[PDB]
Design a protein around this ligand. Structure first.
Ligand SMILES: CSc1nc(-c2cccc(NC(=O)CN3CCOCC3)c2)c2c(N)c(C(=O)NC(C)(C)C)sc2n1
Lengths: 550, 110, 338, 88, 238, 57
């Protein structure tokens, strides 16, 4: 009534070896690595047989086709830990069981799943458990002519692609598990019938089908928290009779990944594009006018050129972000994993860090050299000259490009947030790096303020007539300091507060502080420093005369 | 415990220990774990999914070491085996456990 | 008494004016109309003899057109090789302010002057190559603002004491003094025949002095403001002048009156230097405006404009062969055009 | 600890008055021990432990229906054989 | 580069001369040239002597080469020239600052001095040059005021309708009369100074006597202020 | 007074200047044109020359 074929020195099983048996319910073929071949029709016909197990036959190169044929009551089929290369043949069992289960197991050497592998397999519903197998790909119509209650491709690491037409002829599936499969994308057809989807630890599944394709989806479980946001759209024994109005998706999105677009609020989508343009032309013209100047470059003009270049890099970053927002308008979650972890996000983060640090360092150097020239003004031989300026600015470039490269080297990640700012503060190294950068910016602003105050106290004449000239000095120097402060203080305070793991704001509102307060320097530097000075205006009129538009 | 229907718990056993190339069989007393725990099968086979059914298995396992009596050279002198501390019945981890059917094989070597 | 001599001089001046008007049968433009004007003149900077510290106020070309001199207000008098911008010499001077420079026509000596009231002559073809003061011709009581060499032994200088002075180098004394003048005398020009030379000043009346006779022969007063430069026509029978009122003028020694007046409406900046071309068609002029102008000598047409200077053009010079021209402005750069 | 023989009981969900739907529940054997040396060679994947699993299944059942028209398998006799939905 | 021997020798000469000129340039840019105008009785001779302490009759310019706080100041006393400034002032267009010494004792050669300043201040080439203005021989003014001549109103009648500005800081222990007179002269000069172009070039007044040894500090401070403010326009601060 | 000396010197200077003879402006213009045209061929600026002769590159 039960067959236990174990540890036998059998190399070949002849065809129809089990003829004459009618009361067998179970057949077990386990730990028989001496076995290498099974003849076709080895199980040609049995009445009461329902359960078959093959568990360890490492030397089994393959099973001849038609080994399992014309078995109505065959219900559970298992083939595990076998060195089979050709996919086993099951298309001719012609079973009639209502809940047939087909199990393929630990067959690392199976290369692929042939198309139409289940024609004539069972007249009723079936479940497939393809755990662990080393399939390379699945071709079109691999599932055909049967209601497929459950499909589980769990832990098929070697699997790389499933043909878009694999579900063309199949009904369902009702349950689909692709966990740890590192599959690229799901088939475009047949997913409408899915009730529940499991894709945990499938990091390579960066893109998912549209929400409308998942009409019947309940009880979904994905690997990327962002993907669950696609299901926010409105239309015990867990006994029930009606599906929930909306799917329940896990894991829930984290704080770093709110269910929003890249640009949080609608109005920002405009304000960015304006700050885009205002942040490009001016700094370009400043570069264009000061680089095509007949007259020799003096230290402040070189510093102005480099400051405008840094702000131009900032504007380019903002332009990249705005273009990304425009391209992914309204359905960011689909492209979120692909772009947030692609080269684009890393480039954007590098641009942000490099441009911001270079601009801050250049502003500090400009203020320091202004203070040096105004304090030791009588000693006309101590004036800083172009060679030292170029040396200091090359050092500044190295510092700015080094600090902006560490996130690409693992010290931090630009991939933590959509806007690609270095918000990775988990490990202490990243926390100290971020705090160091923020404190350097704060100290930069403080030294700028101190140098300006010293300039004002040095120019002031405590005895001679200075009542009407000190006021202008104070006024415009306060304008400069206030522009720097309104660009720095909010961003710096919030960043330092959130870098100690005490967030005082949500990431969605963080977006506003980018548009409204971050590029303030990047768009106000050329006007306060470059556009309004006599030298730049005179060069600009020279260019206009050259082009005749004056 | 109860003489009839105890639960998953650790029980002592006599396991045969050898290694790759020892012509001699060693037999040592260590801990395995076995017993019963509730099981389920879904009557409504269909739209509702299948109900998982657990098997008694380890939760924390330590390791003991032993030196065999002059086994052939070329292999590390000291071999190790496992000792079971506590167990509960959960799904057999295929990547870690080989959960098969009735075998009743002797646990002594031959 | 003043009155009778004053009225006699007034009658003499009226007679001179009447004679000149009777002699003004036709102007130059009337007879030049048949001449086809030359096309636009293409002059482009060929060299930029930089490396000079202070603002150049005076330069001059050598006889052979190889070496040139530029003197600045820092005490430097640099001798350049125009071909390869080589600083052939760099003489440091006693008085920082220098307002002129010259050459012995053989090319041996150089001269300089300024607010120190003392002309200084340096020798280049010395023994050990050490350039040192060959002589210091003191005696003037006004700033010396021009220098021109008759030969290697005679120098005719003009200063701000209203009196030109012809010095003998070796003798080092007042060989001759020309004093029939009023106002600061600033510009000297020696005709190809060195017996005559013209001089301009702040009295708006240039004069034609004779080296040997010791007194002026003719006076031309066609200007309205100070005279800043003067130059003979290449044949020596006419000469051009520039004034602060932005009007170039060309007078004749024979006709004894202004032959022509070159002027333009857009120019309200004073002239500082003028020079004819080797043939005479092109008259060059430097202005307080940072550009130089090349005008047709017979048409007054604005033939060409040079705009390669960043400051006032204060000195200009055309080579003897005419192959090139040089201009020095207050930007400390001496630029050669051709 | 206690766990009964897995036997037929009432189904709280679908058992209508006078329509006994019987589903059998309870427990059988399970154990786990380190893989023996004689068995390691026969397995392709390196292993450290084997386990013997037993769950009880309805070796006899019949078709029935409940309000709603859905198929139901009323179990008549179950006994404990291998475990099917037990790997993950 | 492919050159001949003569050309290489010429290039060596050029490079040596260039190095010498570079030395002269680096020493030149560290000196502040300083013009020194004045009149016959202004007393600038005593000034140049009191700056020499801090170190041919046919010539027309002098030298002082005084330095303060290791800063080289060149003071150029243009003397023995004619009484005509209008066109050799062009030569001094690049000086750091102009010094103007005037005598406050000679009631009325004073008026002429005013015109002189109005000529210097409103000149075309000195447009961007600031003027330091020393009022010299203040002690002589003190004696002329304490003598009770009461003829300051005779030459300048506005003295009657003048009042000492409240910003005045007179020394401890002098008659209000001398303070009023000296501040009247200072305000008369400042009226011309502030009339045209004051926002572009400034006028720094001081009261000094021939015996004062503190003038060098006054010029040093004035030059520091002038150069600082000049940096300020190119830094846009003013 | 030196005023009489200056006046006598001035009248003498004008007396000497007046005795000089003049020439018709037409003759002067003709001579200038003849000289300027007879030497217009050799001038390097009226008629520019190629780099073969022009030594300023
Ligand atoms: C968290 S650490 C962090 N945070 C911010 C920053 C600033 C403004 C708002 C928020 N908003 C949250 O941080 C919310 N959350 C949600 C929950 O907790 C953390 C993040 C974060 C920045 C920031 N601007 C950086 C920056 O600009 N660096 C350069 C200037 C380019 C050098 S580095 C950095 N690091």
């Amino acid at each position: 009534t039960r067959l236990s074929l174990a540890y036998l020195p059998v190399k070949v099983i002849p065809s129809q070896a089990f003829r004459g048996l009618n009361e067998v319910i179970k057949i077990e073929i386990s730990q028989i690595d001496s076995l290498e071949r099974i003849e076709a029709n080895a199980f040609d016909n049995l009445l009461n047989l329902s359960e078959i197990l093959i568990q360890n036959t490492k030397n089994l190169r393959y099973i001849e086709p038609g080994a399992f044929i014309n078995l109505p009551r065959l219900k559970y089929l298992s083939i595990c830990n076998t060195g089979i290369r050709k996919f086993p043949d099951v298309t001719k069992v012609f079973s009639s069981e209502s809940n047939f289960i087909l199990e393929i197991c630990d067959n690392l050497h199976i290369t692929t799943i042939p198309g139409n592998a289940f024609q004539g397999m069972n007249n009723e519903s079936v479940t497939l458990k393809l755990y662990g197998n080393g399939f390379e790909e699945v071709q079109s119509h691999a599932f055909n002519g049967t209601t497929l209650t459950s499909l589980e491709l769990k832990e098929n690491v070697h699997l790389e692609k499933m043909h878009n037409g694999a579900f063309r002829g199949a009904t369902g599936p009702k349950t689909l598990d692709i966990s740890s499969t590192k599959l690229q994308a799901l088939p475009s057809y047949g997913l409408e019938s899915i009730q529940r989807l499991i894709a945990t630890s499938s990091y390579s599944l960066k893109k998912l089908p549209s929400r409308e394709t998942f009409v019947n989806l309940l009880e979904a479980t994905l690997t990327y928290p962002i993907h669950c946001c696609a299901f926010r759209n409105l239309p015990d024994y867990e006994y029930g009779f009606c599906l929930p109005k909306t799917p329940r998706c896990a894991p829930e999105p984290d704080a770093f990944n709110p269910c929003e677009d890249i640009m949080g609020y609608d109005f920002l989508r405009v304000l960015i594009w304006l700050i885009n343009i205002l942040a490009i032309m001016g700094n370009m013209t400043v570069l264009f006018v000061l680089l095509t100047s007949r007259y020799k470059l003096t230290v402040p003009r070189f510093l102005m050129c480099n400051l405008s270049f840094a702000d131009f890099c900032m504007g380019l970053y903002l332009l990249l972000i705005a273009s990304v927002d425009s391209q992914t308008k309204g359905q960011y979650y689909n492209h979120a994993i692909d772009w947030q972890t692609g080269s684009g996000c890393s480039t954007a983060g590098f641009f942000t860090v490099f441009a911001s640090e270079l601009s801050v360092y250049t502003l500090t150097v400009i203020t320091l050299e202004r203070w040096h020239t105004i304090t030791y003004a009588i000693h006309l031989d101590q004036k800083l000259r172009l060679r030292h300026a170029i040396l200091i600015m090359l050092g500044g470039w190295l510092f700015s490009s080094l600090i902006a490269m560490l996130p690409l080297v693992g010290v931090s990640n630009y991939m933590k947030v959509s806007i690609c700012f270095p918000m990775d503060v988990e490990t202490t190294l990243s926390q100290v790096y971020i705090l160091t950068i923020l404190i350097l910016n704060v100290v930069a602003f403080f030294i700028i303020c101190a140098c300006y105050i010293k300039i004002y106290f040095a120019v002031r004449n405590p005895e001679l007539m200075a009542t009407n000239k000190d006021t202008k000095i104070a006024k415009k120097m306060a304008i400069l300091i206030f522009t720097d402060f309104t660009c720095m203080a909010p961003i710096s305070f919030f960043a330092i507060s959130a870098a100690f793991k005490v967030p005082l704001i949500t990431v969605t509102n963080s977006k506003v502080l980018l548009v409204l307060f971050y590029p303030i320097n990047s768009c106000a530097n050329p006007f306060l420093y470059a556009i309004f000075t006599k030298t730049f205006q005179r060069d600009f009129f020279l260019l206009l005369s050259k082009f005749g538009c004056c | 415990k109860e003489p009839l229907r105890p639960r998953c718990r650790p029980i002592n056993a006599t396991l045969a220990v050898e290694k790759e190339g020892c012509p001699v069989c060693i037999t040592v007393n260590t801990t395995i774990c076995a017993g019963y725990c509730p099981t389920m099968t879904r009557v409504l086979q269909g739209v509702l999914p299948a109900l998982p059914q657990v098997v008694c298995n380890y939760r924390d396992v330590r390791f003991e070491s032993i030196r065999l009596p002059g086994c052939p050279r070329g292999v590390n002198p000291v071999v190790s085996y496992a000792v079971a501390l506590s167990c509960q019945c959960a799904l057999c981890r295929r990547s870690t456990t080989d959960c098969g059917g009735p075998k009743d094989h002797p646990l002594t070597c031959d | 008494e003043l009155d009778q001599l004053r009225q006699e001089a007034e009658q003499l001046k009226n007679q001179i004016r009447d004679a000149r008007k009777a002699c003004a049968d036709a102007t130059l433009s009337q007879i030049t109309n048949n001449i086809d004007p030359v096309g636009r003149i293409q002059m482009r900077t060929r060299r930029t003899l930089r490396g000079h510290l202070a603002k150049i106020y005076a330069m001059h070309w050598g006889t052979d057109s190889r070496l040139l001199v530029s003197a600045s207000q820092d005490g430097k008098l640099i001798i350049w090789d125009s071909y390869t911008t080589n600083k052939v010499h760099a003489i440091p001077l006693r008085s920082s302010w220098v307002m002129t420079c010259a050459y012995a026509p053989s090319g041996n000596y150089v001269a300089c002057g300024g607010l120190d009231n003392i002309c200084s002559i340096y020798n280049l073809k010395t023994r050990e190559g050490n350039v040192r003061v060959s002589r210091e011709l003191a005696g003037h009581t006004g700033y010396l603002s021009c220098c021109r060499f008759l030969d290697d032994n005679q120098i005719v200088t003009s200063s701000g004491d209203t009196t030109c002075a012809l010095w003998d180098i070796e003798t080092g004394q007042q060989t001759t003094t020309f004093t029939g003048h009023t106002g600061d005398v600033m510009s000297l020009s020696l005709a190809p025949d060195t017996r005559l030379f013209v001089s301009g000043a702040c009295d708006a009346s240039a004069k034609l002095w004779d080296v040997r006779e010791g007194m002026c022969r003719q006076t031309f007063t066609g200007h309205e403001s100070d005279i800043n430069a003067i130059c003979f026509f290449p044949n020596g029978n006419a000469f051009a002048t520039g004034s602060d009122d932005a009007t170039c003028r060309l007078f004749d020694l024979r006709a004894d009156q202004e032959l022509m007046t070159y002027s333009h409406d857009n120019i309200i900046c004073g002239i500082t230097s003028v020079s004819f071309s080797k043939s005479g068609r092109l008259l060059l002029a430097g202005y307080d405006d940072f550009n130089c102008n090349v005008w047709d000598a017979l048409k007054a047409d604005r033939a060409g404009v040079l705009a390669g200077h960043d400051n006032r053009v204060s000195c200009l010079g055309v080579t003897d062969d005419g192959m090139a021209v040089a201009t020095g402005s207050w930007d400390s750069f001496l630029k050669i055009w051709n | 600890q206690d766990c009964p023989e897995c036997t037929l009981q009432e189904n709280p969900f679908f058992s209508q008055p006078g329509a006994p739907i019987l589903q059998c529940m309870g427990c059988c054997f399970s154990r786990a021990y380190p893989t023996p040396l004689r068995s390691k060679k026969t397995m392709l994947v390196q292993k450290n432990v084997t386990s013997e699993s037993t769950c009880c299944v309805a070796k006899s059942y019949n078709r029935v229906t409940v309000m709603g028209g859905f198929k139901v398998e009323n179990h008549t006799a179950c006994h404990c054989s291998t475990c099917y939905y037990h790997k993950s | 580069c492919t050159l001949s021997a003569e050309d290489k020798a010429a290039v060596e000469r050029s490079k040596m001369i260039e190095k010498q000129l570079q030395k002269d340039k680096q020493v030149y840019r560290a000196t502040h040239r300083l013009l020194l105008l004045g009149a016959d009785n202004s007393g600038k001779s005593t000034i140049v002597k009191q700056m020499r302490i801090y170190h041919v009759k046919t010539s027309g310019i002098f030298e002082t080469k005084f330095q303060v706080d290791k800063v080289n100041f060149h003071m150029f006393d243009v003397g023995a020239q004619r009484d005509e400034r209008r066109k050799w002032i062009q030569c001094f267009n690049d000086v750091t600052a102009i010094i103007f010494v005037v005598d406050s004792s000679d009631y009325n050669r004073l008026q002429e001095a005013l015109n002189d300043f109005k000529s210097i201040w409103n000149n075309r080439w000195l447009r961007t040059i600031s003027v330091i203005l020393f009022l010299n021989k203040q002690d002589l003014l003190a004696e002329k005021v304490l003598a009770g001549k009461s003829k300051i109103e005779d030459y300048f009648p506005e003295f009657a309708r003048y009042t000492t500005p409240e910003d005045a800081t007179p020394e401890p222990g002098e008659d209000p009369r001398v303070t009023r007179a000296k501040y009247f002269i200072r305000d008369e000069f400042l009226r011309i100074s502030t009339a045209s172009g004051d926002g572009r070039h400034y006028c720094y007044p001081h009261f000094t006597c021939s015996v004062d040894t503190e003038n060098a500090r006054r010029i040093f401070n004035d030059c520091r202020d002038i150069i600082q403010r000049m940096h300020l326009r190119q830094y846009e601060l003013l | 007074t030196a005023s009489i000396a200056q006046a006598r010197k001035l009248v003498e200077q004008l007396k000497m200047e007046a005795n000089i003879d003049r020439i018709k402006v037409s003759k002067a213009a003709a001579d200038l044109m003849a000289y300027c045209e007879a030497h217009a061929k050799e001038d390097p600026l009226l008629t520019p020359v190629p780099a073969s002769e022009n030594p300023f590159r």
